[PDB]
Amino acid sequence: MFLISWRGYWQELIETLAWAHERTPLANLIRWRDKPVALSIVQARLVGLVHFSVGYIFTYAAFLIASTSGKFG
Amino acid sequence: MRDLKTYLSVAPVASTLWFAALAGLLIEINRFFPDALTFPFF
Amino acid sequence: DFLVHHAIALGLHTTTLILVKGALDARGSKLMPDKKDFGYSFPCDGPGRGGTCDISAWDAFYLAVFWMLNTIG
Amino acid sequence: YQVVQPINGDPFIGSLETPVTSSPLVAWYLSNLPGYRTAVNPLLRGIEVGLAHGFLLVGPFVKAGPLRNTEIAGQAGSLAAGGLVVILSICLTIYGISSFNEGDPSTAPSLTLTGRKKQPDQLQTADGWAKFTGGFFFGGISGVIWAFFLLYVLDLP
Amino acid sequence: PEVKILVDRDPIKTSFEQWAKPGHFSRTIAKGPDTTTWIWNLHADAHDFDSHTSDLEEISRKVFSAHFGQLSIIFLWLSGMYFHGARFSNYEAWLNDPTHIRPSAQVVWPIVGQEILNGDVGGGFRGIQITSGFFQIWRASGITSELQLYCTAIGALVFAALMLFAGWFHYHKAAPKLVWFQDVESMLNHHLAGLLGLGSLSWAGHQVHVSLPINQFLNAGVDPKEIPLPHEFILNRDLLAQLYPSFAEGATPFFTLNWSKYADFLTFRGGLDPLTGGLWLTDIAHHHLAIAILFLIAGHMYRTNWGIGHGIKDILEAHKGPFTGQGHKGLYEILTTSWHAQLSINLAMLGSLTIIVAHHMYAMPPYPYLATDYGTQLSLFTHHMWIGGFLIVGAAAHAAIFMVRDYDPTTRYNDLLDRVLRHRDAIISHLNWVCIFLGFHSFGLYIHNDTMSALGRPQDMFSDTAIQLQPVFAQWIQNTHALAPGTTAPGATTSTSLTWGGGDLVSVGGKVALLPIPLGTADFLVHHIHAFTIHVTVLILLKGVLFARSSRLIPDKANLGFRFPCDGPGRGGTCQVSAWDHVFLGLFWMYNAISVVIFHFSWKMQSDVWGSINDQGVVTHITGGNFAQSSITINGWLRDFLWAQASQVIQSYGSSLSAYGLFFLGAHFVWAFSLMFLFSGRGYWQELIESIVWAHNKLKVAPATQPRALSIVQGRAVGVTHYLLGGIATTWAFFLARIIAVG
Amino acid sequence: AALYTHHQYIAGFIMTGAFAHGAIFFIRDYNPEQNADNVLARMLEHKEAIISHLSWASLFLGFHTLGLYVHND
Amino acid sequence: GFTPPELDPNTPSPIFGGSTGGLLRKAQVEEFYVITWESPKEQIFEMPTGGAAIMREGPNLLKLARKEQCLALGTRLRSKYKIKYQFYRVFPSGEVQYLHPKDGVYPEKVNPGRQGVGVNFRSIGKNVSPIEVKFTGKQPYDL
Amino acid sequence: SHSVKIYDTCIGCTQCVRACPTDVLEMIPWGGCKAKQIASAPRTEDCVGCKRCESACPTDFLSVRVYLWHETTRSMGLAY
Numbered sequence A: 001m002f003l004i005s006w007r008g009y010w011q012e013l014i015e016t017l018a019w020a021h022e023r024t025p026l027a028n029l030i031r032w033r034d035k036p037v038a039l040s041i042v043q044a045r046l047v048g049l050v051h052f053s054v055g056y057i058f059t060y061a062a063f064l065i066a067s068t069s070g071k072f073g
Numbered sequence B: 001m002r003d004l005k006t007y008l009s010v011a012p013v014a015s016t017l018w019f020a021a022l023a024g025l026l027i028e029i030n031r032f033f034p035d036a037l038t039f040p041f042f
Numbered sequence C: 001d002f003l004v005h006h007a008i009a010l011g012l013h014t015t016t017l018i019l020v021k022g023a024l025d026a027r028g029s030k031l032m033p034d035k036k037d038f039g040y041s042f043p044c045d046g047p048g049r050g051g052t053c054d055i056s057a058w059d060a061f062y063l064a065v066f067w068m069l070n071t072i073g
Numbered sequence D: 001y002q003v004v005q006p007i008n009g010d011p012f013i014g015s016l017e018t019p020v021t022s023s024p025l026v027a028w029y030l031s032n033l034p035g036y037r038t039a040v041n042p043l044l045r046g047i048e049v050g051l052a053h054g055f056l057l058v059g060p061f062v063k064a065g066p067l068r069n070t071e072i073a074g075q076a077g078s079l080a081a082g083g084l085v086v087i088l089s090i091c092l093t094i095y096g097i098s099s100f101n102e103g104d105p106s107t108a109p110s111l112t113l114t115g116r117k118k119q120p121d122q123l124q125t126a127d128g129w130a131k132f133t134g135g136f137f138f139g140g141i142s143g144v145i146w147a148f149f150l151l152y153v154l155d156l157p
Numbered sequence E: 001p002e003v004k005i006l007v008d009r010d011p012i013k014t015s016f017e018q019w020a021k022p023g024h025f026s027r028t029i030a031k032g033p034d035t036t037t038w039i040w041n042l043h044a045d046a047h048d049f050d051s052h053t054s055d056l057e058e059i060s061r062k063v064f065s066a067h068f069g070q071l072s073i074i075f076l077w078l079s080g081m082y083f084h085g086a087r088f089s090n091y092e093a094w095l096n097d098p099t100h101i102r103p104s105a106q107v108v109w110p111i112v113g114q115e116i117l118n119g120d121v122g123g124g125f126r127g128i129q130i131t132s133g134f135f136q137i138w139r140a141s142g143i144t145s146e147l148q149l150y151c152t153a154i155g156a157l158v159f160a161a162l163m164l165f166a167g168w169f170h171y172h173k174a175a176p177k178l179v180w181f182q183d184v185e186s187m188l189n190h191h192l193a194g195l196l197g198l199g200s201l202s203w204a205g206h207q208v209h210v211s212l213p214i215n216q217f218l219n220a221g222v223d224p225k226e227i228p229l230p231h232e233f234i235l236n237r238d239l240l241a242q243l244y245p246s247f248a249e250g251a252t253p254f255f256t257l258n259w260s261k262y263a264d265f266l267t268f269r270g271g272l273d274p275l276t277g278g279l280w281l282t283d284i285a286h287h288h289l290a291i292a293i294l295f296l297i298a299g300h301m302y303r304t305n306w307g308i309g310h311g312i313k314d315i316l317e318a319h320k321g322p323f324t325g326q327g328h329k330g331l332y333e334i335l336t337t338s339w340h341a342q343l344s345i346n347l348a349m350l351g352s353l354t355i356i357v358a359h360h361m362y363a364m365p366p367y368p369y370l371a372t373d374y375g376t377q378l379s380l381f382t383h384h385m386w387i388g389g390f391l392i393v394g395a396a397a398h399a400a401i402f403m404v405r406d407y408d409p410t411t412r413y414n415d416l417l418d419r420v421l422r423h424r425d426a427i428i429s430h431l432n433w434v435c436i437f438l439g440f441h442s443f444g445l446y447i448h449n450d451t452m453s454a455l456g457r458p459q460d461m462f463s464d465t466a467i468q469l470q471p472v473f474a475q476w477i478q479n480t481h482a483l484a485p486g487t488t489a490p491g492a493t494t495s496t497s498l499t500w501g502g503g504d505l506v507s508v509g510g511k512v513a514l515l516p517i518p519l520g521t522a523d524f525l526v527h528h529i530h531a532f533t534i535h536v537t538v539l540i541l542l543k544g545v546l547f548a549r550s551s552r553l554i555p556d557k558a559n560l561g562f563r564f565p566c567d568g569p570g571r572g573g574t575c576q577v578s579a580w581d582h583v584f585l586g587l588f589w590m591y592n593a594i595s596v597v598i599f600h601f602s603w604k605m606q607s608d609v610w611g612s613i614n615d616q617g618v619v620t621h622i623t624g625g626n627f628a629q630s631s632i633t634i635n636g637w638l639r640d641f642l643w644a645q646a647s648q649v650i651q652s653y654g655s656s657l658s659a660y661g662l663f664f665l666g667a668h669f670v671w672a673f674s675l676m677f678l679f680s681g682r683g684y685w686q687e688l689i690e691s692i693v694w695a696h697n698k699l700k701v702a703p704a705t706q707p708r709a710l711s712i713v714q715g716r717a718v719g720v721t722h723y724l725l726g727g728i729a730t731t732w733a734f735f736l737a738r739i740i741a742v743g
Numbered sequence F: 001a002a003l004y005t006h007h008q009y010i011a012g013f014i015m016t017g018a019f020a021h022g023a024i025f026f027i028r029d030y031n032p033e034q035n036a037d038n039v040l041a042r043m044l045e046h047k048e049a050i051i052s053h054l055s056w057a058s059l060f061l062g063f064h065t066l067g068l069y070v071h072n073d
Numbered sequence G: 001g002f003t004p005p006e007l008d009p010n011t012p013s014p015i016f017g018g019s020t021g022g023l024l025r026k027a028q029v030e031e032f033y034v035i036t037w038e039s040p041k042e043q044i045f046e047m048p049t050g051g052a053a054i055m056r057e058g059p060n061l062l063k064l065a066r067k068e069q070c071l072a073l074g075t076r077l078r079s080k081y082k083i084k085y086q087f088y089r090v091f092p093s094g095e096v097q098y099l100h101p102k103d104g105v106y107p108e109k110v111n112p113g114r115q116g117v118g119v120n121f122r123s124i125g126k127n128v129s130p131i132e133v134k135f136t137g138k139q140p141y142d143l
Numbered sequence H: 001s002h003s004v005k006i007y008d009t010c011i012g013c014t015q016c017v018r019a020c021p022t023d024v025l026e027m028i029p030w031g032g033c034k035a036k037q038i039a040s041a042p043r044t045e046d047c048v049g050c051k052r053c054e055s056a057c058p059t060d061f062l063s064v065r066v067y068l069w070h071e072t073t074r075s076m077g078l079a080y
């Protein structure tokens, strides 16, 4: 998702969410102190790479150990 | 006529005719000499 | 084992290719002759001149990690 | 004749007036919820919000928790609701610490929908929010205790 | 004001001069290529007619001839199908033993060992088993000999010639006028009554004269060669009366209104014929007659030249309320000016119709021996689902195109569209929240069940045996359907479909055809997953459409076009803001939805319906009813569905199904190949091509057409195209291998 | 199996980082005048030769290794 | 010498029913913008925030949330119609800041009263290597 | 805010100022080129970083350069 989909789509989506919060009663009593924005382009590449690598390592580590220790041989 | 021949010389049509002739030749070669993992004539 | 070792050679060569092209084109290229002024990690240089997505050396690293994971895989 | 009109007659403010937004039933009901009683001590408004939410939270935790079918201890699942009130009272507390400072005035609007000047709600003040968190916590744990206090002659106990 | 025929003579000369000039239609492309990007643009703008010119008449004539060319190609395709059924098929052998013979219509040449794909299909035939279902259609129509398929192929070839000639004619010779295209009332009248009405009537006429009698003789076991020819039922009516007695009257009850006599071959019995497994052909003929009458009537709503009738403009303008202002006023001018608006509407409706076809053809098998050809049924369902999904994504794309190019409030205004634009923010925010809620309350349940089953807590899962989430509404609906015949449907003899009515299990040739479908917690979870995926696809596409012109981030997005990469790294980053990229992402999400849909279909049919029936009535399904317990878990979908049913495709080497084993891996390859494009950007690739160009120029072998990496939009287009191709072809190979082996 | 997999992925990441910091050196620390016409500047001087041949070797290995695997398939 | 026109409140605003793309809390506590134009007649124009509005005859005032929305609307006012336009910035204090056209002349037309800002007097490739500005707050292009 | 710089390779075609969507560029008189005018960036506080000006520069290499710097509310394009 972070590697295929890129930023501008999510920025416009966050804008439509900021309007939603300011116009919703009760919740508009809570104000964010940092403006919501979409992740940076470089940040998106990094976050997508980290998810890719973590899934890579964890998927293979699970299969490796379970297929080997399940038989132990 | 000259425009028709100029169309036949465009890249996709020339590629199809050239690759069709090439595909047919390799098919007949593997038809008269099927399999062959080596160069047997030495 | 002969076929797998050549896949290994493919993985080493391509991962080396990505990292070396990024390291040598990090200070500049025909597309962006002043890349050294923009630093190591920046998003891009805009849609002008045809499009310059993933043109920094950081992006070269980011592309090479996929090939590293594929090679070690 | 049309139903949808601009927000308070101004078309260039990002909103609209609809039966969901501007209607006598909706306007009165929201104006009578404790969070929108802009002239009441926030401690009491917190008590009401805490009592309502602490009372509501007991149901799901008891009927859906892990000990739900072990009736020996499932009724005590209100502790989970009470723990969430504790956690939420922390979320409420840490919110005001960052939002409002000690000497800062109120950030609430000091106007009315009709233009007349108004006294801002003290909820958007440091001490006002502190009273609301304290009220929400006191009413919260009281709502959980009072909900668990009842148990019998109900179709879903 | 008077509808009439209007054409121009010889508007465009027929010559090969413009054949030899690539990119003649565009003014920038016609100069030839300076770089390689030209070569791609020539194909990307090949069918963008409204960007080649601004004259609506030229555009309409081009579109007309393109339709004729498409019809020519479809007729050529049908000619090929019928000709392969006649020349390289075992249809005559499948006609004598439809329950044992595998339908096949393609035989490969023996060149490089591919003759192994010519597998034993029965009837003394070595070929490729077909799942298109043409055998069932040709049997339902009454075709018996290869000669009739030959004649149908020849007729289809002649019709392809006719369509090609008409396409040339209505562009180079008598080319119609703009007002001719814009006579919408006349066109809808002729399409409702002339096209659909008379078409249904013609097919009902064939079915009552050829399909019904020949199929009676086929059901009775008469040898197809010993069956009388169809036209012999049109000469000697004794032959038609010996099968259906009412034909002895001779159209007299029709004119005297004694239609109750025709209940012999025009019935309302419903269900399935237990001998073939398809719907009763008498019911289908009666259906086509009713459809013909209804459409012949409906083709009279719109006024033309004789005063009587409606004008769509008045009907639109008259529909305005207190919530929508002067709604519908202006829509008649929009839909008679913009081709893209009509295309969006028709793509949406045709895709949804294809999906409805996919459902209705599995739940009510229309053709004989279709319900038991599990390969054909699975393939038809999946194919129609994919067609519909793609067409709906295209509807979204063309709606956005209309927004960017044909929308203008100063000339052709509409109040409804303006009101929608004035709260796009609320619409998109609410759809966003609905999507989040559905994602948590469907897939989150699957994660809950996985984590409870892994922790040794099978009673804390959401299951038919633990925390139950029964689809009470759908169960009550199918029950109400079951009890309808004889109550809220007295004319109906059995249930509408077999999935409704309790009992009444129809089986053909030792295999089951249909039975009541169970609905439990698994069905509930999967239906909510489907709703969620549909909602997210709708969110992506509709958000792209509504924000095509302007947004808080880019207030002049319409000037950038419909298809542009970005608007710079600024504003934090503006990648994929164009509506084109919204269609690009909606493609992935439509894939993600349709794949789960078809996997649901496959597992449900292989678990709770399809199987083998005993002589005593013991039905064992292809999988042992494992849908209730295994499909409520992601690990169950991984293990009891993928890992178990992919065996056939990973074991097909050395058999006639090895081609599916090759396509499996090839589609894996192209799917992963797309990830290079989807994860990268063209700047790196251009910098690589720079050094490659150095290497070429060193040896005096650099091309004049300067190589350039793909454009950003082209990068995404290639990425999504390869991603879709790989995924769909992988599922195609897997499905076909599995269902042809275990079917 | 766990130990060999662990160290090979560790080494793969370390190699990507080695080339990453090589590019970071070229941008942040490389002084072209103080490295005038030595081996380091000459690497930049024929960057196209190094990158093109790395590309040829990756193409050669990739074309043939894949082709042989597909042939046997 | 040029004198910027002061912002006159109570100036008519175009006819519009309202949209969700209007002002937010940013206008209340941060800043907002106001574009003004003359126009010859009552027309319809597409809003940079939502749908369509009716441009009133005579002086028009329109308040937006971003500066880019003002210049985009102004550019269309100058292209489709033939209308001159100005726009300002408004802080929550009530202060107004004149923005564009700054000189009263459009920025694409050279004007003699303008001073250079950020103009480097060398080829772009004549910037220095980053090592020569290391440990300093400088950049190779600020010079 | 983002930094924008103009180099003396500018020919004075006024294209960066026309493409700018937030009125950051200006055309000032100069004596270096034929059109007697060069570009300047006096209002980079409104610059969003779209690099639409660089896409329109005919100089090789560019004469407008947009160096993306410290993000602000104005540079991020926020209407909220």
Ligand code: CLA
Pocket: C010, C014, C017, C018, C063, C064, C066, C067, E669, E670, E671, E672, E673, E674, E675, E676, E677, E679, E680, E688, F055, F056, F058, F059, F060, F061, F062, F063, F066
């Ligand atoms: C299965 C997925 C996949 C595949 C097949 C490739 C393949 C390739 N990558 Mg790649 N990559 C991938 C994923 C993939 N990548 C991903 C996910 C990333 C992260 C973004 C990258 C990032 C990446 C980078 C940064 C680079 C590459 C490079 C390369 C090329 C290396 C040269 C080579 O080995 O010779 C060829 C190997 C092949 C596999 C080619 C196979 C296709 C053959 C030619 C089919 C023959 C055509 C045949 C007639 C079919 C007819 C088709 C018909 C429709 C016309 C190669 C074509 C490097 C490069 O460009 O090399 C110079 C490069 O620098 N890749």
Ligand code: CLA
Pocket: E063, E064, E067, E068, E071, E180, E181, E183, E186, E187, E190, E191, E193, E194, E195
């Ligand atoms: C009873 C009259 C009639 C009939 C049968 C049709 C039939 C058809 N029209 Mg059509 N149309 C009609 C009247 C009719 N139209 C009128 C009055 C108008 C307004 C003036 C239009 C304007 C119109 C447009 C703009 C388009 C169509 C199109 C189509 C085709 C739609 C594709 C399809 O359904 O595939 C089904 C295929 C078949 C049913 C095969 C049967 C085709 C037969 C041989 C055609 C005979 C009908 C024809 C009108 C008779 C005159 C031809 C004669 C002079 C030789 C279809 C064949 C589309 C098209 O051009 O497709 C190419 C399209 O773009 N029509």
Ligand code: CLA
Pocket: E043, E044, E045, E046, E047, E048, E049, E347, E390, E391, E392, E393, E394, E395, E397, E401, E563, E580, E583, E584, E587, E721
């Ligand atoms: C009746 C249906 C229909 C019609 C008439 C059109 C018509 C049009 N579309 Mg559209 N579209 C449709 C359906 C339709 N579309 C659907 C269902 C989708 C969803 C996928 C889209 C999504 C879409 C997009 C995103 C775009 C268009 C665009 C266009 C315009 C330019 C088309 C062009 O020249 O592209 C040229 C065609 C090609 C370059 C061929 C591409 C090759 C395909 C994609 C892959 C081939 C794979 C093949 C199926 C199987 C593999 C075989 C292979 C191995 C050999 C044109 C007026 C473009 C436009 O500019 O709008 C104005 C635009 O960008 N369409």
Ligand code: CLA
Pocket: A001, A002, A004, A005, A013, E431, E432, E433, E435, E436, E437, E438, E439, E440, E443, E444, E447, E536, E539, E540, E585, E588, E589
């Ligand atoms: C497996 C990969 C993956 C996942 C998990 C998602 C997930 C999501 N996508 Mg996405 N997407 C993907 C791939 C993926 N996508 C790819 C490859 C693309 C490129 C085509 C896209 C393109 C895309 C678009 C264009 C959009 C989304 C949207 C969404 C969101 C829909 C709302 C929702 O379902 O809420 C529910 C959340 C989930 C289903 C995620 C799992 C949540 C688990 C079950 C709950 C666990 C909570 C737990 C307590 C965590 C606490 C632990 C703590 C200790 C840290 C959702 C979060 C849409 C959106 O923005 O939302 C409206 C949208 O617009 N996606």
Ligand code: CLA
Pocket: E691, E692, E695, E696, E699, E701, F052, F053, F055, F056, F059
């Ligand atoms: C006359 C055509 C031609 C010639 C002489 C060369 C020559 C060369 N190329 Mg090359 N190349 C070509 C076309 C050609 N290329 C085309 C069309 C493409 C686009 C697919 C490429 C893409 C390409 C890449 C990516 C690379 C090279 C590289 C190289 C060099 C190393 C050898 C090699 O890897 O070749 C391999 C050849 C291919 C991968 C594709 C060749 C396709 C056919 C066989 C060539 C075209 C023939 C032409 C259509 C015939 C015209 C007929 C005419 C009489 C009418 C070498 C000097 C490598 C390099 O940089 O050197 C270190 C390298 O990385 N080429």
Ligand SMILES: CC1=C(/C=C/C(C)=C/C=C/C(C)=C/C=C/C=C(C)/C=C/C=C(C)/C=C/C2=C(C)CCCC2(C)C)C(C)(C)CCC1
Pocket: C023, F018, F019, F021, F022, F023, F025, F026
């Ligand atoms: C003794 C012996 C032998 C021999 C061996 C040899 C001959 C060796 C070697 C070796 C080698 C030879 C190795 C290596 C490796 C390497 C590598 C791995 C590399 C690297 C590099 C890099 C990574 C770079 C970085 C950078 C850049 C990029 C730029 C800037 C600068 C720098 C440097 C930072 C034999 C086996 C025969 C036998 C047994 C005994």
Ligand SMILES: CC1=C(C/C=C(\C)CCC[C@H](C)CCC[C@H](C)CCCC(C)C)C(=O)c2ccccc2C1=O
Pocket: A001, A002, A003, A005, A006, A007, A008, A010, A011, A037, A038, A039, A040, A041, A044
């Ligand atoms: C979903 C998505 C977003 C939206 C994502 C956002 C706004 C991030 C939201 C994160 C929330 C707060 C939850 C994150 C939870 C983390 C697990 C918490 C980690 C925090 C610390 C442990 C570091 C983008 O901004 C984007 C940008 C460019 C390309 C692709 C995408 C993209 O795919």
Ligand SMILES: CC1=C(C/C=C(\C)CCC[C@H](C)CCC[C@H](C)CCCC(C)C)C(=O)c2ccccc2C1=O
Pocket: B015, E676, E677, E678, E680, E681, E682, E685, E708, E709, E710, E711, E712, E714, E715, E716
């Ligand atoms: C690999 C890749 C490329 C490079 C891809 C290219 C250059 C595709 C073109 C390759 C073909 C093979 C060149 C066409 C060759 C001609 C058909 C002539 C060949 C001669 C005969 C063999 C026909 C991009 O341009 C790109 C752009 C944006 C995001 C990602 C990527 C991306 O991942």
Ligand code: SF4
Pocket: A006, A041, C043, C044, C045, C046, C047, C051, C052, C053, C054, E565, E566, E567, E568, E569, E573, E574, E575, E576, E681, E712
């Ligand atoms: S699409 Fe490419 S050029 Fe445009 S902002 Fe994204 S990475 Fe940069």
Ligand code: SF4
Pocket: E570, H004, H016, H019, H020, H021, H022, H023, H024, H025, H046, H047, H048, H049, H050, H051, H052, H053, H054, H066
């Ligand atoms: S990057 Fe965009 S906003 Fe900034 S100066 Fe250039 S054109 Fe203007």
Ligand code: SF4
Pocket: H006, H009, H010, H011, H012, H013, H014, H015, H016, H017, H038, H039, H053, H056, H057, H058, H059, H062, H063, H064
């Ligand atoms: S676009 Fe470049 S050459 Fe033209 S005026 Fe601006 S800086 Fe000068």
